[PDB]
Write a protein that binds this ligand. Structure first.
Ligand code: JPG
Length: 282
């Protein structure tokens, strides 16, 4: 079925939970043996969220190459994404090592450091220009260059230096600051405006490594971001845009990381975002 009328048909029939459970039942199951090794317990935020072995990002390190991060490679759309958990106190150095080694231009953050009164990720970037951060375990230096605070999101320019080689690179940090503590946004308008700002920066384009996107676990809000982006790109590429099937795209992405889209409300919100976004593109 088309999307917008499939949407009204699920609303009127109140069957979002059944649709979402079907997706959960059909989703791929692949091994995640490296994530579950005892030496990696303090590298995982949640015991039930792990990268598959076949798609996990490897650190270029011979001691321990593990990080909780996955490469989502979308062949027809010609887009790739790295989805990862919010960094932990003992993985902030690994996080920036990955950004460096994968040649990423942008980092997309969809959570606040504190939500619901608890810490959802480490404070992993500097908050003042004159107070830079040094990660001694991976030999990197990180400096805040500029910060632009808007009503729904903040954009930061960062300088990452590899202290071994003295090479430097500019990284863009796109921070969506207004996702509610509970539920999903009422309108997708600010989320779509944010997606378009990430696109306009070059951070999603083939001349760079894959964008790094995270929330707390790296599957819920993060899944919503890449699902919406890929579906909108396919609608532009194909002769028949109504042939884009959001459920089929989501199952394809779930071949590369488990659990993408965590609730039926997030599934409905993803439909809404793609529907409204397809009208603005034209
Ligand atoms: C772009 C800009 O205005 C600027 C000026 C002085 C110093 C740094 C600047 O930004 C950079 C430069 C290099 C990498 C990342 C950001």
């Amino acid at each position: 079925m088309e999307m917008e009328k499939e949407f009204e048909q699920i609303d009127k029939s109140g069957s979002w939970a059944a649709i979402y459970q079907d997706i959960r039942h059909e989703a791929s199951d692949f091994p995640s043996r490296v994530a579950k090794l005892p030496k990696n317990k303090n590298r995982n935020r949640y015991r039930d969220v792990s990268p598959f072995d076949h798609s996990r990002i490897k650190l270029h390190q011979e001691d321990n190459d593990y990080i909780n991060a996955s490469l989502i490679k979308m062949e027809e759309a010609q887009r790739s994404y790295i989805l990862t958990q919010g960094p932990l106190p003992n993985t902030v150095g690994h996080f920036w090592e990955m950004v460096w080694e994968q040649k990423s231009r942008g980092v997309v953050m969809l959570n606040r450091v504190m939500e619901k009164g608890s810490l959802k990720c480490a404070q992993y970037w500097p908050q003042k220009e004159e107070k830079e951060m040094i990660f001694e375990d991976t030999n990197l230096k990180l400096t805040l260059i500029s910060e632009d605070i808007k009503s729904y999101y903040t954009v930061r320019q960062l300088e990452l230096e590899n202290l071994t080689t003295q090479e430097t690179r500019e990284i863009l940090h796109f921070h969506y600051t207004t996702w509610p503590d509970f539920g999903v946004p009422e309108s997708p308008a600010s989320f779509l405006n944010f997606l378009f700002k990430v696109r306009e920066s070059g951070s999603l384009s083939p001349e760079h490594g894959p964008v790094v996107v995270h929330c707390s676990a790296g599957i819920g809000r993060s899944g919503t971001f890449c699902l919406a982006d890929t579906c909108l790109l396919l609608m532009d590429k194909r002769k028949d845009p109504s042939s884009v099937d959001i459920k089929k795209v989501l199952l394809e992405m779930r071949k590369f990381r488990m659990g993408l889209i965590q609730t039926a409300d997030q599934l409905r919100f993803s439909y809404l975002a793609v529907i409204e976004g397809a009208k603005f593109i034209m």
